[PDB]
Structure formats: structure tokens, C-alpha cells
Amino acid sequence: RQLARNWVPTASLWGAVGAVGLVWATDWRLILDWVPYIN
Amino acid sequence: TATYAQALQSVPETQVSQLDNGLRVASEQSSQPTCTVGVWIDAGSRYESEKNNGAGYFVEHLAFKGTKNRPGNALEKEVESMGAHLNAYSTREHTAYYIKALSKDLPKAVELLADIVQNCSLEDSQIEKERDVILQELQENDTSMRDVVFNYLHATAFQGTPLAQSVEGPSENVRKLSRADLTEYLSRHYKAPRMVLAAAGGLEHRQLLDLAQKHFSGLTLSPCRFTGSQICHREDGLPLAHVAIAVEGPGWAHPDNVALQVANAIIGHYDCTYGGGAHLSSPLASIAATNKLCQSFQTFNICYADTGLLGAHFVCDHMSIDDMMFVLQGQWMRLCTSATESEVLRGKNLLRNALVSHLDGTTPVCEDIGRSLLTYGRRIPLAEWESRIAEVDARVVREVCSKYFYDQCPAVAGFGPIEQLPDYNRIRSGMFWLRF
Amino acid sequence: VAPTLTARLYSLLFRRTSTFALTIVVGALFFERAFDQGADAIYEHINEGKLWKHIKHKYENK
């Protein structure tokens, strides 16, 4: 039509997931310490 | 004229009157030569004890066996003298005694009727006769599988509540039953305000109440537990296996009860015998005709005082069971998220039609009042129902169904040859999508 | 009467499986940052002066 229903907010979270995931993985960008990260 | 907006406007309105001892009076004038004369009583099995179980049911037959002033079979020989049909029936939450008649001889009718309500001949001649027929019928009752599974259905959800119990009650009680205990329940719940009276026809309100005419009317419940569970009667001989599945819902009086009226109408129903074929709009009636995954099914709603029942009842091949299901969870689940306002409309229209449809005819008009009184009181918010219809929204239905469907504990009833039917633990995981 | 955090929590998070999934990584992150940081102390608490971390101070940069 196109009506994209709660899929929109749904999907909104999803990308955030594995993005964090790769961030959780190892990635490149450090991540300003923010609770202790070793020196 | 007839124009839908104006069509709501001109109707004979709800009437009400109240006598002293708790009797209710009410009416509507249909400008008709005939009148449905009826009575509705809220005394339930949910009132009935463990011996009283099925007694009122047994009682139900008895009234017409003769009464105090009118011994055996002197009762109807006056009734059919007029040529007026007569009928009575009962229910877990209600009992309705009623008459369909010409407005002329009504002065007898209620007076005939009033006699019956309380004055009764309790005669073990009829008792044993009726004690037998019921017993005779008790066993015969295995012939219609429909009613059968529902009995299982309640008992599995409402276990531990008088609501969960057989209407006719277990058998042995009927033998053990004695008409004194009746006289109890006769005396107990047949008082007013429990009693309620209504009628519709050429009858005007006051010409009802005046001839409501001095006779008499009269001088406990609990919220029920809801059981995530399963029941199965496995018998593989039979050709087909019914299924019922449901979750509990709001009572009679509750806002959302109407909001969920449409979701059913939208998801609709299918049967072997339609001429609709595979081009119907209902995804179910499309597929279930396409691959004939079932013989037929229909969805129900039953809202108790405090409770409500939403689910369907289907019949499918002993090898076709799974696939009906995996479909059926599709529809409910997809509604809760991805539904759309278009299909809302097609649902919206239907319920308007069905609403307006049932409203024709003396008795049904007469009949609404009694429960409605026992339910919402006088309220027959006819034109309001329309306004009520305008209330429902896309978010509404989603937001409503989100409550009562997504990630819940469903009830499962079954009747053989079930075996294919997956274990609960599938159905449960199958309630909540994983986003698929 | 207020709901126990449980009644809050599902309604808040566990209801939508994404969220239910989402939080999982989230705490798991903060978890390890703190978690490993604790055990090593406990570890090195247990072994005192057996490790250069304690020992090497004797001779480290002279």
C-alpha cells in the first residue's frame, strides 16, 4: 500500500542488535571506558 | 423513510417498570397482533451445589407435567386451546421460560405463567418418569459430538468452580435426586429480584404492567480460576476428530467485549458446503476450501458474568490436523501485529449487518431484554451500538488482541482420533511468534 | 499496591521477544567488564607476592 506496521519499530531494534553484536564482537572503535575497561 | 442514520432513530423504546417484591417489568411495542411473553432467571448451576448439579435441569422438564392448580397435563390442554406455541429452556447462567401468543388472551398467559413459576405439582409419578427419560437421554447424549467436547472444554479451564460442571450434572445424582432438594432450590433462587419479566408485541408498557397484575415474584458467586492445561479423549475408531481451542476473556460487562466482536467476524469461518470457493477474502475460508485442510470450522465467543471465551471449533482429517493449526495460529498472531484498516472495514460492515439482522422478530426482540436486564440491565443501546462500532480502531484491535492473545496460556480440548495433534509444548511456543 | 519488578519486567521487556533478546547482549556486556575484573583480584588475592605483579616491584625499572 504500503502500510508498514509495528514491523517498523520491530526492525528498529533489530539493526541495533547485531550492531551491538559486532560491537560486542570485537570491532575496531574502542568504546570510551564507561565502567572499567582495562587501560 | 428507511435511511441507516435515521433508521436508528425511530424504534419503540425500551420500557421499564418495577414491582415491590423485586420483580422487573419492561417492554417494547412492535405494533404486532402477537406477543412473545417470556421470563428469564439468573439461577445457574454456578449457584447449584454438588448435589443440586443438574437438578434445575431436571426441574426444567417438570413444570409442564402439571402444576399445583393444574394437575398433570391440564396445563397445556389450555395452552394449545388458544393455538399459542409454548417453549422453555435453560442455560448455565440463565433460564428462560417464555410464550409466543396472540396479544388477546395474554391475561391468562402470565397468570397461567405465574402459577407455573412457583406453584408446582411435585409428584413422584412424573419424577420417576422424568428420572428415566433423562437417564435414557444421559447415555444418548454421546451421539452429538459437538456439545460433548465443550463439556470437556469448560471443565479443563474452570476446574474447581461450579461453572466447570455438567449442566445436566452427573448421572447418579439424577437417580439420587429428591424433590425436596428441588423445593429448596425452588424456594432458594426463584425469588425476585432474581426473577425478571419482559415482552414485546402490540403490547404497550402500562397495559403490560397493569396486567402484570398482582400475583407474586419472590422474597453467591465467585471469580473462577483459569487453567493452562490440556484434555484428550483418544478414541481412534471414529472417522473424524473435533477440536476446540480457546483462551479466557472479559465478562459480559466490559468495554473490550465489543472490540473483539470484529476480530472473529474478520477471521471468519469456513465450511465444506459454501459456494464461496477459493476466492473468499477470509484467509481461512480461502485455504480451508483450497486444500480442504478441514471439513469446517467456526469461531465462538462466550462471555460469562466475569469471564469470556474466545476460540474456534474445527473438524479436519485425522492426517490433516496439524496443518489446520499451524494455519490458525497464523491468523491470530498476524492480527496482533501487522493487521490493516482495510480488512477492518469488511469486518466492521458485517457485524453491523449481523447486529441489525438478528433484531427482527418478536421473540428475539423479547429475548434480548431478559438477558440484557440480567446483564446490562434495561440497556438496549441500539443506536449506541452503532456509535460503539465507530469506536473501534486499528490500534484498538491490535492493542486489544495484544492483551488477550500474545504469549498466553491457551486451553486445549480434544476428541479422538486425536493422536496427530501436537503436544502442548509446541502450541505454547507456537503462541508467541519469534517474529516469525 | 505496586507490581513486583517481575510484573513490571515482562510487561516492560520480556513481552517483545526482540527486547527480550535485546537486553541479553546488553547486560552480558557490562557483565564481563565487571565479572572478570572481580575474579582476578580474588585470584591475585589468593596468590600474594608469588607474581611479578607483586614481585616485580622489587626489581622493576631498578
Coordinates of C-alpha atoms in Angstrom, one line a residue, chain A residues 1 3-7 9-10 12-13 15 17-18 21 23 25-26 28-29 32-33 38-39:
Chain A
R1 CA 0.0 0.0 0.0
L3 CA 1.5 0.4 5.4
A4 CA 4.4 -0.8 7.4
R5 CA 3.1 -1.6 10.8
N6 CA 4.9 -2.5 14.1
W7 CA 7.5 -4.1 11.9
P9 CA 9.6 -0.3 15.4
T10 CA 10.4 -4.1 15.4
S12 CA 14.2 -0.6 14.5
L13 CA 15.5 -2.8 17.4
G15 CA 19.7 -3.5 13.4
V17 CA 21.0 -5.8 18.0
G18 CA 23.9 -7.1 15.9
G21 CA 26.7 -7.6 18.4
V23 CA 30.5 -4.1 18.9
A25 CA 32.2 -9.0 19.0
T26 CA 35.5 -7.1 18.9
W28 CA 37.6 -1.5 15.9
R29 CA 36.3 1.5 17.7
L32 CA 35.0 5.2 25.9
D33 CA 35.7 3.2 29.0
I38 CA 41.4 -2.0 31.1
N39 CA 43.8 0.8 30.3

